[PDB]
Design an enzyme around this catalytic site. Sequence first.
Site, short mmCIF file in Angstrom:
data_model
loop_
_atom_site.label_atom_id
_atom_site.label_comp_id
_atom_site.label_asym_id
_atom_site.label_seq_id
_atom_site.Cartn_x
_atom_site.Cartn_y
_atom_site.Cartn_z
CB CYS B 108 -6.60 4.67 -4.68
SG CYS B 108 -7.03 6.43 -4.40
NE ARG B 111 -6.22 2.33 -1.30
CZ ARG B 111 -5.68 1.35 -1.14
NH1 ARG B 111 -6.73 0.28 -0.64
NH2 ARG B 111 -4.56 1.01 -1.08
CD1 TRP B 280 -5.84 16.51 -3.42
CD2 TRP B 280 -7.96 16.72 -2.89
NE1 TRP B 280 -5.96 15.98 -2.44
CE2 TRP B 280 -7.13 16.05 -1.93
CE3 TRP B 280 -9.28 16.80 -2.57
CZ2 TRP B 280 -7.53 15.75 -0.65
CZ3 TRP B 280 -10.03 16.34 -1.46
CH2 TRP B 280 -9.21 15.92 -0.32
CD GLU B 285 -2.76 11.84 -10.19
OE1 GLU B 285 -3.56 11.26 -10.76
OE2 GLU B 285 -3.06 12.52 -8.97
C1 HEM Z 1 -8.74 12.36 -3.20
C2 HEM Z 1 -7.66 12.62 -3.92
C3 HEM Z 1 -7.01 11.50 -4.64
C4 HEM Z 1 -5.75 11.16 -4.87
C5 HEM Z 1 -4.53 12.29 -4.66
C6 HEM Z 1 -5.58 9.78 -5.65
C7 HEM Z 1 -4.71 9.66 -6.12
C8 HEM Z 1 -4.30 8.50 -7.06
C9 HEM Z 1 -3.38 8.28 -7.95
C10 HEM Z 1 -1.81 9.26 -7.89
C11 HEM Z 1 -3.68 7.08 -8.70
C12 HEM Z 1 -2.84 6.35 -9.89
C13 HEM Z 1 -3.21 6.92 -11.04
C14 HEM Z 1 -1.92 7.21 -11.93
O1 HEM Z 1 -0.77 7.44 -11.61
O2 HEM Z 1 -2.04 6.80 -13.08
C15 HEM Z 1 -4.88 6.80 -8.07
C16 HEM Z 1 -5.85 5.82 -8.68
C17 HEM Z 1 -6.95 5.39 -8.06
N1 HEM Z 1 -7.80 6.10 -7.67
FE1 HEM Z 1 -7.37 7.77 -6.61
N2 HEM Z 1 -7.00 9.36 -5.88
C18 HEM Z 1 -7.95 10.35 -5.12
C19 HEM Z 1 -9.19 10.03 -5.04
C20 HEM Z 1 -10.03 9.12 -5.44
C21 HEM Z 1 -11.27 8.86 -5.54
C22 HEM Z 1 -12.43 9.99 -4.78
C23 HEM Z 1 -11.62 7.57 -6.05
C24 HEM Z 1 -12.98 6.91 -6.15
C25 HEM Z 1 -13.90 7.38 -5.49
C26 HEM Z 1 -10.31 7.18 -6.23
C27 HEM Z 1 -10.16 5.83 -6.85
C28 HEM Z 1 -9.08 5.44 -7.58
C29 HEM Z 1 -8.94 4.15 -8.24
C30 HEM Z 1 -9.87 3.15 -8.71
C31 HEM Z 1 -7.45 4.16 -9.10
C32 HEM Z 1 -6.92 2.90 -9.80
C33 HEM Z 1 -7.26 3.12 -11.27
C34 HEM Z 1 -6.79 1.80 -11.99
O3 HEM Z 1 -7.10 0.65 -11.31
O4 HEM Z 1 -6.31 2.05 -12.91
N3 HEM Z 1 -9.35 8.00 -5.93
N4 HEM Z 1 -5.52 7.55 -7.09
C1 LIG Z 2 -10.29 10.61 -8.81
C2 LIG Z 2 -8.86 10.86 -9.16
C3 LIG Z 2 -7.82 11.49 -8.40
C4 LIG Z 2 -6.40 11.58 -8.77
N1 LIG Z 2 -5.75 12.12 -8.07
N2 LIG Z 2 -6.03 11.28 -9.78
C5 LIG Z 2 -6.68 10.46 -10.92
C6 LIG Z 2 -6.38 9.94 -12.14
C7 LIG Z 2 -6.04 8.45 -12.01
C8 LIG Z 2 -6.84 7.39 -12.29
C9 LIG Z 2 -7.90 6.90 -11.48
C10 LIG Z 2 -8.75 5.88 -11.64
C11 LIG Z 2 -8.86 5.31 -13.04
C12 LIG Z 2 -8.04 5.88 -13.93
C13 LIG Z 2 -8.28 5.17 -15.46
C14 LIG Z 2 -8.22 3.80 -15.49
C15 LIG Z 2 -8.63 3.13 -16.78
C16 LIG Z 2 -7.77 2.62 -17.77
C17 LIG Z 2 -8.17 1.97 -18.85
C18 LIG Z 2 -7.26 1.76 -20.15
N3 LIG Z 2 -9.78 1.73 -18.69
C19 LIG Z 2 -10.57 2.03 -18.06
N4 LIG Z 2 -11.79 1.58 -18.19
C20 LIG Z 2 -10.12 2.52 -16.95
C21 LIG Z 2 -7.01 6.88 -13.70
C22 LIG Z 2 -8.23 10.45 -10.28
#
Ligand code: HEM
Ligand SMILES: Cc1cc(N)nc(CCc2cccc(CCc3cc(C)nc(N)c3)c2)c1
Lengths: 407, 411
Positions: B108, B111, B280, B285
């Site tokens: 992420c 963060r 947000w 994305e």
């Molecule tokens: C505040 C604005 C946020 C932005 C701009 C942001 C941005 C992103 C982006 C661009 C990704 C990659 C997703 C992709 O391109 O497929 C991501 C992944 C992720 N974010 Fe955020 N995030 C935000 C907030 C949060 C919040 C509030 C949480 C949880 C409390 C979070 C937890 C995660 C997690 C766990 C992933 C990884 C998903 C995975 O392992 O597949 N993020 N974030």
């Molecule tokens: C909160 C938030 C903010 C942001 N800017 N973008 C996102 C979308 C990206 C995002 C973040 C966490 C998780 C996912 C899906 C991951 C995922 C994928 C698969 C295949 N199985 C699962 N159980 C989970 C996607 C989320």
Amino acid sequence: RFLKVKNWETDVVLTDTLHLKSTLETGCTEHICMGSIMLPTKDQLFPLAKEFLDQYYSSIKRFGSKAHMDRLEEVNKEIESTSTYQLKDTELIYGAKHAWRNASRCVGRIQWSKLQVFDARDCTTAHGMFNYICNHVKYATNKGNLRSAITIFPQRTDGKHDFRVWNSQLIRYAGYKQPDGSTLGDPANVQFTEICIQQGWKAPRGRFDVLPLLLQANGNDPELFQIPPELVLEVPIRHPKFDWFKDLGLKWYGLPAVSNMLLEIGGLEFSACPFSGWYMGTEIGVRDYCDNSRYNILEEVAKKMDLDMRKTSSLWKDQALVEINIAVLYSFQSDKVTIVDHHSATESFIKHMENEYRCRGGCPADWVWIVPPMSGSITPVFHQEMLNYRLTPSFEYQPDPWNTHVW
Amino acid sequence: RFLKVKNWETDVVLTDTLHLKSTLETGCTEHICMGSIMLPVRTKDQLFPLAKEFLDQYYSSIKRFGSKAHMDRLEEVNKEIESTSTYQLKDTELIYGAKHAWRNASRCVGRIQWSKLQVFDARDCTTAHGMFNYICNHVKYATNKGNLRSAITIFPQRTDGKHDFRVWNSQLIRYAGYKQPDGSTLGDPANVQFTEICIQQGWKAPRGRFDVLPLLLQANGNDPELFQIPPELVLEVPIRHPKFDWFKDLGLKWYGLPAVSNMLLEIGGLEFSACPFSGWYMGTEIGVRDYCDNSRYNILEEVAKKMDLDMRKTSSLWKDQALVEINIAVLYSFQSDKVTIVDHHSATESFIKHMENEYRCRGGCPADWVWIVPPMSGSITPVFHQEMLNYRLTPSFEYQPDPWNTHVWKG
Ligand code: HEM
Ligand SMILES: Cc1cc(N)nc(CCc2cccc(CCc3cc(C)nc(N)c3)c2)c1
Ligand code: HEM
Ligand SMILES: Cc1cc(N)nc(CCc2cccc(CCc3cc(C)nc(N)c3)c2)c1
Ligand SMILES: C[C@H](O)[C@H](O)[C@H]1CNc2nc(N)[nH]c(=O)c2N1
Ligand SMILES: C[C@H](O)[C@H](O)[C@H]1CNc2nc(N)[nH]c(=O)c2N1
Ligand SMILES: [Zn+2]
């Protein structure tokens, strides 16, 4: 033990078995991934030799034959006696092609088997090296119809008599630090440029000055040589739609030729082995031109396009980036110098993965380096899981010789 | 043992000691890197050390390690585990745990915001209707009429794994996809299978290009139930371009609130299988992945046609050109309607500052490069040249299997 790789765009799944024949270490552990890090005796030599010869003789369908076994004894009798050994021309050619085949960071590997190999093992002086290199440059350049090639200088012995090309590439531009604070020319090359001037080079002190070659034969002090200007094919950079683009006065060279790597075949080490192919367009337009730490021309270009540079959200860096790269491709194509775009190069690699999975059991690949530095996700490699592992024969980094060599 | 990372643009070197606190595997070995691999009931025995680690962390963070209130809390959790096989987190421990799960998310890029997270405790929830109410309130508070705020809603933890709370949607808000007999897709291709389930559960699909999906909600291991989110709660933004007037006639729109609802939250050994969270969007994305993936809306051909690009040779970079104008359109549209969004230059620059501060104050920042680097213009953003160490800290968010694959239907 068997490992699966999936493509998330096409849902297509491949099975990797080649990684079991893996041999060097990745840098990673089960606790921590180091995938993004740039750099992580008679008794030692024989297994290595055996390992290679076994793979060599297998590939010509001669595994366990009399010709195989005799060569194994021959190399063994030679090690126990001379503390090293010599590759046959066939093994040399095979080793070099496989070092490329195994280069997990190279997107251009679909071409691995068309490598022209020049055997320079009879070389003894820096003047000799210079001659071999000029012949390589001319053969590879081929008036713009580029051809891949490698030239192989004598292998390491006691490590006191190494051959080395001090240049990091055969053809590169100088870099000069000025009292102004900023840099003239290419900032990547400032130090090597200090060493050239400190060994005697008369620097023209311009933006695009082709560096002299700095050649070390047999562990001796290195010497300077100027590549004949008529062999260094260069391209002035213009744009198909922007007439003002030429007034930047940008140019680049047609031949990418990496000269600082070490080629390892059957435990033998070739410290000097310049190799060359042809450019993918982003290498020049994105990295060379647009890196903060390189020519860094983005600021200057976007200005000429009259874009709003007030805020990052107008994507003005991104707009300029695409036009810079359009121009590079266009310039090369119009001067008829082979070049490949990142869409075409990645599509070729994917087809090459498929072939190596079906024909070899896999394809070592480093996603961080295969995915182009612009527009990653609209290229098919982005969605492609890849397994990264180290096979021999291989190319390796080695310390810059100036830190190591003693005058 | 200290580990160094270098930034190849600025020569800054940093030192990680935090990877020393790392637990879970990576998938990688000494002989193989799994860096680009996408997806690589507990006993009393295993639960107490996990409780212990977590409570030790929590009590250090509040500067009360080894206090009487620390020792008594360990004793109390101990007893609760031996007698009931599980335990309940105090409110403070839940809040701290969910912020740290975010702080620890190595994929992420957002963060920097980890400590500003609204936590909603829905551990008293018992039914799917109860869940729908919690989720509407989360959507409303998080949306805040465009001035988006990060939030997470936390439903009851797993017990025997036979009474799980799940939100079947992968995001709270997402558009339907419908496979046509001719092989083409209408709406979002990523959501076809889930749309199909909804239809079979009795949803009457309008069958348009942007149909907000209904919530399918499972409480306490029961069969899930359907609910429509009130439309007035679904903030949407029509997509237009600052210079290209024909852009609006493509008919594109997107929703303002990204809210992931399919992850599992692990804190001190406990597993919260329904824990939707939202933030947000970063513009790429929507503009790169949602619109321009071949397996998604795939509007690249359509946009480049209207720009009159030379589409006869990839080497004109027509694809790269169109992708940029689409992303320009997405940022302009959100900013003009006053919906929070961040561009990828600003996000990555923020993340780099976050990362340096984390090394100084925490001794590290686990980070996944394959995921942090944006899907366009990677190398003109400062993360590209940044070496990163990827490892797994708890609390953490984990993938879990899709519930239609595992659920025991009752009828
Ligand atoms: C505040 C604005 C946020 C932005 C701009 C942001 C941005 C992103 C982006 C661009 C990704 C990659 C997703 C992709 O391109 O497929 C991501 C992944 C992720 N974010 Fe955020 N995030 C935000 C907030 C949060 C919040 C509030 C949480 C949880 C409390 C979070 C937890 C995660 C997690 C766990 C992933 C990884 C998903 C995975 O392992 O597949 N993020 N974030
Ligand atoms: C909160 C938030 C903010 C942001 N800017 N973008 C996102 C979308 C990206 C995002 C973040 C966490 C998780 C996912 C899906 C991951 C995922 C994928 C698969 C295949 N199985 C699962 N159980 C989970 C996607 C989320
Ligand atoms: C023929 C056209 C070729 C193309 C388009 C090509 C493409 C590339 C590119 C784009 C990279 C990464 C570039 C970067 O530094 O950003 C690379 C890396 C590399 N290539 Fe190629 N290549 C070609 C030919 C060759 C040949 C002939 C060899 C050797 C015989 C070779 C061996 C390597 C090696 C060893 C690396 C990675 C070195 C490292 O670890 O940094 N390539 N290739
Ligand atoms: C043959 C060829 C074709 C092509 N299209 N591009 C290139 C340039 C990319 C390239 C390839 C291999 C090797 C390098 C440099 C290796 C290298 C890099 C660094 C940072 N330090 C070192 N000591 C050594 C660069 C080469
Ligand atoms: C195969 C590869 O790991 C996979 O396509 C990943 C790569 N990086 C990604 N990065 C982000 N931010 N989002 C993604 O969906 C993906 N997909
Ligand atoms: C830190 C990171 O490993 C570094 O920026 C790498 C990433 N990917 C790269 N990819 C290519 N093709 N060339 C590079 O020089 C780099 N640099
Ligand atoms: Zn790894």
